[PDB]
C-alpha cells in the first residue's frame, strides 16, 4: 500500500492507485490524516472515479471484481470522510455520478449472482447505497434481496455481508425525505421483510443476526404512515406469535419488540411490559454473596458465584481499609446491596440486557447507579461471562466495574452525573488501583515509551475521545502515587467528595498538581527502575 | 443518530 | 443498530 498515492491532483492518477492498490490499501483512507483525505476526496476525484466506476459496472460479467470492490469501496469511503471530516465537502455534481454507478452495478444482469467473490463488491455497492445517500432508490432491488435470500446464498460470507446492507439501507434512509415519504407505501419491501425475519431456516444459523435485524427494521417501519401499514402490522404479529421473548427466535421477538415498543403502540401488539417478564425468565438464578452483594445470572456454576464473591468480597475489604471508610456510606445514598446481573455471553448481553435495564449494548458492561436518594432505587451492574475473562468466575469487567460501585456509594455524594468538577482520573484510577493493586504492567509500560502526562494533565482527563491510555492507565499511576505518597491529601479531598463540594474537591487537586509534579516523576523513575 | 458505515468485516 | 455479521465481545465497559 501506498496512501499517499491517492493524494496526486490527476484523477488518472488516483484511478491507477485504486485498480494497483486495491480495497484492503484503500481501507486506509477512512482513517487516513485530514490532509490525504482532502486531497483523496476532491469533488473532481469522486466524478471522475464514479464515471471510470460506471464503464466498468456495465462491463462486469459476474465472478467477482478486485477493481470494482476497491472503486466502490473509495466512493464510500469519501462519503465517510465528507460525514466526518470538515474539510472535505461535495459540490452537488458528485452525487449524480455515484448514482450513476451504482445504477450500473444494479442493472447489470449479474446483479443477483451467488458468490463469494461477487458478493465482497456486490457489498460495497450496497453499503454505497446508504453513504451516498440514495436510501430512496432502489427500493425494488432492497425487495428482491430480501424475497430471493435463501439458504444457498447464506453459504456464502460476503454474501450475508451484502444482503445485511440492505438494514443499513433501512436504518440509514430515517433522514432521507424521499425515503421517509415513499417508504410508508411499499407494501411489496414490508411482505418481505417481515417473511425474512419469518424465515424458520435462519434460526441458529450463519445469517440469524440477518433475521433480527430484518424483525428490528420491520418495526422500526411503524413510525411511518401509507398503503403499506397494514402488512407491516401483520408481519409483526406473526413475528410476535410465531417466536417467543425468550427461547426459540428470541433474537428476532427481542429485535422487533425493541422498535415497535418505541415507535408504535406496545399495547396493538399485546407487548406491553415484556421487559419485567423477560427479567425474570433470563436472569433466573439468583445467589446472595452478603448483605452487599446479590448476584442475578443467566447461566452460572456454583464454583462461578463462590469465586465472584470472594474474589468481590475481598475488594470489598481493601477497597474500605484503604479509603478509610468505616463503612458509612455518603450522604444520601441507600444503594445498600449492589445487585451484579450476568448474562451467560456477550451475545446474551447484546440480545436481553438492552430491554431489561433500558442501556445500550455496544459495550463492555456497565454500573447504573441511578438515583442514590431515591426510594426504590436499585444499583445494577450489568456484565456478561466471557471465555477469556478472568478466572474463577470469568465474569468480564468485573473486578475493575465493581469498584464504582464502592467508590459511588463512600467517596462520591450524589449520582453519577453531580460533579461540577472533572473526575474521572479519580474515578477510573481507584477502579484500577483497588482492583488490581501493584500489578499493572501496562501502567509501567506507558511511562517509559515516550509519553507521559503531568498530574494537572490528567486531574483534566474526560471521556471524550476515549484515551484509554490516559484515563486507566495513567488515572492509575496517579491515584498509587496519591496513596503511597500523599495519603493525607487523599483523606483531605474525601472529605470534600463525598459531601459534594466539587469546588473545594478541584482546589485540593489544583494544589497536588502545583506541588508534586517533579515527585511524581521521581515515583514513576523507581517503579520503571523496579521494572528493571 | 447517523453514522456512515466504516469497514465490513473480512471472513477469519 | 443492525447488527453486522461480527460483533467484539472484549469492550471497555459504557
Ligand atoms: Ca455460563
Ligand atoms: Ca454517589
Ligand atoms: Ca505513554
Ligand atoms: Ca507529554
Ligand atoms: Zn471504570
Given at each position: 500500500?501506498?496512501?499517499?498515492?491517492?493524494?496526486?491532483?490527476?484523477?488518472?492518477?488516483?484511478?491507477?492507485?485504486?485498480?494497483?492498490?486495491?480495497?484492503?490499501?484503500?481501507?486506509?483512507?477512512?482513517?487516513?490524516?485530514?490532509?490525504?483525505?482532502?486531497?483523496?476526496?476532491?469533488?473532481?476525484?469522486?466524478?471522475?472515479?464514479?464515471?471510470?466506476?460506471?464503464?466498468?459496472?456495465?462491463?462486469?460479467?459476474?465472478?467477482?471484481?478486485?477493481?470494482?470492490?476497491?472503486?466502490?469501496?473509495?466512493?464510500?469511503?469519501?462519503?465517510?470522510?465528507?460525514?466526518?471530516?470538515?474539510?472535505?465537502?461535495?459540490?452537488?455534481?458528485?452525487?449524480?455520478?455515484?448514482?450513476?454507478?451504482?445504477?450500473?452495478?444494479?442493472?447489470?444482469?449479474?446483479?443477483?449472482?451467488?458468490?463469494?467473490?461477487?458478493?465482497?463488491?456486490?457489498?460495497?455497492?450496497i453499503?454505497?447505497?446508504?453513504?451516498?445517500?440514495?436510501?430512496?432508490?432502489?427500493?425494488?432491488?432492497?425487495?428482491?434481496?430480501?424475497?430471493?435470500?435463501?439458504?444457498?446464498?447464506?453459504?456464502?460470507?460476503?454474501?450475508?455481508?451484502?444482503?445485511?446492507g440492505?438494514?443499513?439501507?433501512?436504518?440509514?434512509?430515517?433522514?432521507?425525505?424521499?425515503?421517509?415519504?415513499?417508504?410508508?407505501?411499499?407494501?411489496?419491501?414490508?411482505?418481505?421483510?417481515?417473511?425474512?425475519?419469518?424465515?424458520?431456516?435462519?434460526?441458529?444459523?450463519?445469517?440469524?443476526?440477518?433475521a433480527?435485524?430484518?424483525?428490528?427494521?420491520?418495526?422500526?417501519?411503524?413510525?411511518?404512515?401509507?398503503?403499506?401499514?397494514?402488512?407491516?402490522?401483520?408481519?409483526?404479529?406473526?413475528?410476535?406469535?410465531?417466536?417467543?421473548?425468550?427461547?426459540?427466535?428470541?433474537?428476532?421477538?427481542?429485535g422487533?419488540?425493541?422498535?415497535?415498543?418505541?415507535?408504535?403502540?406496545?399495547?396493538?401488539?399485546?407487548?406491553?411490559?415484556?421487559?419485567?417478564?423477560?427479567?425474570?425468565?433470563?436472569?433466573?438464578?439468583?445467589?446472595?454473596?452478603?448483605?452487599?452483594?446479590?448476584?442475578?445470572?443467566?447461566?452460572?456454576?456454583?464454583?462461578?458465584?463462590?469465586?465472584?464473591?470472594?474474589?468481590?468480597?475481598?475488594?470489598?475489604?481493601?477497597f474500605?481499609?484503604?479509603?478509610?471508610?468505616?463503612?458509612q456510606?455518603?450522604?444520601?445514598?441507600?444503594?445498600?446491596?449492589?445487585?451484579?446481573?450476568?448474562?451467560?455471553?456477550?451475545?446474551?448481553?447484546?440480545?436481553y440486557?438492552?430491554?431489561?435495564?433500558?442501556?445500550?449494548?455496544?459495550?463492555?458492561?456497565?454500573?447504573?447507579?441511578?438515583?442514590?436518594?431515591?426510594?426504590?432505587?436499585?444499583?445494577n451492574?450489568?456484565?456478561?461471562?466471557?471465555?477469556?475473562?478472568?478466572?474463577?468466575?470469568?465474569?468480564?469487567?468485573?473486578?475493575?466495574?465493581?469498584?464504582?460501585?464502592?467508590?459511588?456509594?463512600?467517596?462520591?455524594?450524589?449520582?453519577?452525573?453531580?460533579?461540577?468538577?472533572?473526575?474521572?482520573?479519580?474515578?477510573?484510577?481507584?477502579?484500577?488501583?483497588?482492583?488490581?493493586?501493584?500489578?499493572?504492567?501496562?501502567?509501567?509500560?506507558?511511562?517509559?515509551?515516550?509519553?507521559?502526562?503531568?498530574?494537572?494533565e490528567?486531574?483534566?482527563?474526560?471521556?471524550?475521545?476515549?484515551?484509554?491510555?490516559?484515563?486507566?492507565?495513567?488515572?492509575?499511576?496517579?491515584?498509587?502515587?496519591?496513596?503511597?505518597?500523599?495519603?493525607?491529601?487523599?483523606?483531605?479531598?474525601?472529605?470534600?467528595?463525598?459531601?459534594?463540594?466539587?469546588?473545594?474537591?478541584?482546589?485540593?487537586?489544583?494544589?497536588?498538581?502545583?506541588?508534586?509534579?517533579?515527585?511524581?516523576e521521581?515515583?514513576?523513575?523507581?517503579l520503571?527502575?523496579?521494572?528493571? | 443518530?447517523?453514522?456512515?458505515?466504516?469497514?465490513?468485516?473480512?471472513?477469519? | 443498530?443492525?447488527?453486522?455479521q461480527?460483533?467484539?465481545?472484549?469492550?471497555?465497559?459504557?
Open positions: 500500500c501506498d496512501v499517499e498515492a491517492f493524494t496526486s491532483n490527476s484523477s488518472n492518477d488516483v484511478l491507477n492507485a485504486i485498480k494497483t492498490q486495491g480495497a484492503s490499501c484503500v481501507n486506509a483512507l477512512f482513517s487516513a490524516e485530514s490532509r490525504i483525505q482532502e486531497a483523496a476526496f476532491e469533488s473532481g476525484h469522486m466524478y471522475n472515479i464514479a464515471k471510470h466506476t460506471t464503464d466498468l459496472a456495465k462491463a462486469y460479467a459476474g465472478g467477482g471484481s478486485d477493481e470494482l470492490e476497491a472503486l466502490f469501496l473509495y466512493l464510500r469511503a469519501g462519503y465517510y470522510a465528507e460525514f466526518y471530516n470538515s474539510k472535505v465537502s461535495f459540490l452537488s455534481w458528485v452525487t449524480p455520478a455515484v448514482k450513476e454507478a451504482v445504477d450500473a452495478f444494479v442493472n447489470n444482469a449479474n446483479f443477483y449472482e451467488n458468490s463469494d467473490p461477487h458478493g465482497k463488491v456486490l457489498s460495497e455497492v453499503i454505497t447505497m446508504d453513504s451516498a445517500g440514495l436510501q430512496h432508490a432502489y427500493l425494488p432491488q432492497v425487495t428482491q434481496w430480501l424475497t430471493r435470500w435463501d439458504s444457498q446464498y447464506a453459504q456464502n460470507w460476503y454474501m450475508r455481508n451484502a444482503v445485511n440492505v438494514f443499513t439501507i433501512l436504518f440509514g434512509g430515517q433522514w432521507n425525505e424521499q425515503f421517509v415519504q415513499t417508504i410508508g407505501n411499499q407494501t411489496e419491501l414490508a411482505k418481505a421483510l417481515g417473511d425474512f425475519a419469518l424465515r424458520s431456516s435462519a434460526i441458529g444459523a450463519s445469517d440469524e443476526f440477518m433480527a435485524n430484518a424483525g428490528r427494521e420491520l418495526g422500526r417501519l411503524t413510525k411511518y404512515s401509507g398503503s403499506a401499514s397494514s402488512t407491516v402490522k401483520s408481519k409483526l404479529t406473526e413475528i410476535f406469535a410465531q417466536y417467543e421473548m425468550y427461547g426459540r427466535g428470541d433474537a428476532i421477538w427481542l422487533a419488540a425493541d422498535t415497535v415498543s418505541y415507535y408504535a403502540d406496545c399495547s396493538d401488539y399485546g407487548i406491553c411490559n415484556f421487559e419485567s417478564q423477560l427479567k425474570g425468565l433470563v436472569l433466573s438464578q439468583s445467589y446472595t454473596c452478603s448483605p452487599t452483594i446479590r448476584i442475578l445470572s443467566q447461566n452460572m456454576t456454583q464454583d462461578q458465584h463462590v469465586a465472584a464473591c470472594s474474589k468481590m468480597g475481598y475488594e470489598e475489604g481493601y474500605h481499609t484503604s479509603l478509610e471508610t468505616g463503612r456510606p455518603v450522604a444520601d445514598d441507600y444503594n445498600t446491596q449492589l445487585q451484579v446481573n450476568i448474562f451467560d455471553s456477550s451475545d446474551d448481553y447484546g440480545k440486557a438492552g430491554p431489561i435495564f433500558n442501556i445500550s449494548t455496544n459495550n463492555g458492561g456497565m454500573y447504573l447507579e441511578g438515583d442514590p436518594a431515591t426510594p426504590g432505587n436499585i444499583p451492574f450489568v456484565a456478561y461471562e466471557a471465555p477469556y475473562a478472568n478466572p474463577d468466575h470469568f465474569v468480564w469487567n468485573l473486578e475493575h466495574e465493581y469498584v464504582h460501585y464502592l467508590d459511588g456509594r463512600f467517596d462520591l455524594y450524589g449520582g453519577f452525573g453531580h460533579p461540577t468538577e472533572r473526575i474521572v482520573w479519580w474515578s477510573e484510577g481507584i477502579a484500577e488501583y483497588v482492583s488490581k493493586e501493584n500489578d499493572n504492567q501496562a501502567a509501567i509500560d506507558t511511562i517509559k515509551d515516550g509519553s507521559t502526562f503531568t498530574l494537572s490528567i486531574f483534566e482527563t474526560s471521556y471524550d475521545g476515549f484515551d484509554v491510555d490516559r484515563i486507566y492507565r495513567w488515572g492509575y499511576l496517579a491515584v498509587r502515587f496519591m496513596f503511597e505518597r500523599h495519603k493525607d491529601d487523599v483523606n483531605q479531598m474525601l472529605i470534600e467528595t463525598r459531601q459534594g463540594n466539587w469546588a473545594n474537591y478541584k482546589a485540593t487537586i489544583n494544589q497536588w498538581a502545583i506541588l508534586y509534579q517533579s515527585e511524581f521521581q515515583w514513576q523513575q523507581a520503571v527502575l523496579e521494572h528493571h | 443518530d447517523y453514522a456512515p458505515t466504516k469497514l465490513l468485516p473480512q471472513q477469519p | 443498530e443492525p447488527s453486522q461480527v460483533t467484539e465481545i472484549y469492550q471497555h465497559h459504557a
